Ligand SMILES: N[C@@H](CCC(=O)N[C@@H](CS(=O)(=O)O)C(=O)NCC(=O)O)C(=O)O
Ligand SMILES: N[C@@H](CCC(=O)N[C@@H](CS(=O)(=O)O)C(=O)NCC(=O)O)C(=O)O
């Protein structure tokens with residue numbers, strides 16, 4: 321069992337949970353109510369300077385950053401699946417897509433949504449266009465392969481499946497992007513028997529409810 | 535020879551150049567004047583949807599995102615050096631640090647600097663504190679090892695060496711962070727004989743001059 325400090329609703333935490341459930345990595349869960357500021361306590365901050373979740377403690381091996389935990393868990397406990405290609409030529413593409421998500425797609429989701437979700441800010445028209453612009457890039461990126469970075473399912477699809485599944489929950493109009501919508505369906509049917517509903521569908525809603533609420 | 539569409543001053547491009555020079559990967563350079571908008575032309579946008587640099591074309595293998603190019607080049611042409619540890623337990627830490635840089639340290643550098651550098655915006659006091667807060671996290675991260683993610687020099691140090699060397703050029707007060715300053719010296723002496731001055735020192739200045747100018 322690997323320890324994971326997380327928050328169900330958290331998009332980054334859900335990537336880790338899905339993968340873990342998919343490759344059978346048993347998780348000893350520790351909810352960290354970031355809202356009540358539990359991550360700021362001395363002993364967690366001593367554990368992780370940046371005091372964020374998800375944070376993994378795999379038998380002493382501490383590590384954070386959802387996407388780094390994906391590659392890691394997969395290298396440490398993966399099997400017959402190939403959610404993280406050994407061939408570097410292929411792994412590069414998967415890496416590229418995971419960086420795309422962290423530094424572009426998701427970042428822009430957080431920018432147009434979380435503020436209003438954290439302080440009731442007003443939506444920013446310009447900040448919504450940038451998100452659309454990125455979805456556009458992704459749309460172009462979905463042309464080459466059947467999946468997002470390989471012609472088979474990989475951890476990139478998981479990361480990105482969580483970012484887009486959230487966008488969708490926020491009821492963002494994804495009509496302009498049919499490849500994204502098409503790949504999004506595949507990701508759901510692919511994860512359905514691995515806790516998608518239980519883990520990601522229930523999480524996107526509460527997170528969307530908190531956005532629509534206020 | 536691997537093709538690289540780049541811009542000398544660009545921090546992401548300089549990571550790639552340093553590594554490449556360090557591990558002897560010959561580069562066929564193609565300057566892309568982003569200022570004049572050359573990256574927006576049809577044939578580059580056809581090459582890279584997100585039309586950004588650095589962009590590598592290694593014998594047909596197209597790929598972008600400076601940090602993904604680092605791991606790649608190192609897996610494709612590395613040698614006696616170990617700038618990217620095979621042991622996954624170790625690679626994780628190096629990955630974590632590269633994500634830290636992309637999604638945190640560097641991102642916050644771009645936020646407090648490039649606007650005024652792109653549109654003469656005024657510096658944001660709050661946005662400068664966040665950068666300080668991240669340097670603080672990094673400072674805590676430099677405790678465990680002699681270098682940033684290993685007890686030996688890796689590609690993380692290169693990525694991060696470029697981000698902090700830029701911060702420094704912007705004359706940011708780094709007095710509060712002695713570990714960062716200490717590691718920063720090691721990185722310079724480490725890269726000095728691999729084009730540091732020629733590649734990164736000359737690049738940080740022009741970029742700083744463009745910030746101080748306006
Ligand atoms: N890039 C990180 C982002 C993680 C992150 O932002 N976590 C938030 C919570 S959530 O938005 O994902 O729900 C957090 O821990 N925030 C508290 C803190 O940073 O102190 C990842 O991919 O794991
Ligand atoms: N995360 C990317 C960022 C690259 C980036 O932002 N490149 C800029 C130029 S620079 O700021 O690095 O100099 C670019 O190509 N901009 C043009 C564009 O995005 O259209 C990386 O690490 O490579």
Ligand SMILES: [Cu+2]
Nearest residue numbers: 321322378379
């Ligand atoms: Cu265990």
Ligand SMILES: [Cu+2]
Nearest residue numbers: 462463464499
């Ligand atoms: Cu098509």
Ligand SMILES: [Cu+2]
Nearest residue numbers: 515516517518
């Ligand atoms: Cu289910």
Ligand SMILES: [Cu+2]
Nearest residue numbers: 535536592593
């Ligand atoms: Cu060649």
Ligand SMILES: [Cu+2]
Nearest residue numbers: 676677678713
């Ligand atoms: Cu010390």
Ligand SMILES: [Cu+2]
Nearest residue numbers: 729730731732
């Ligand atoms: Cu030199």
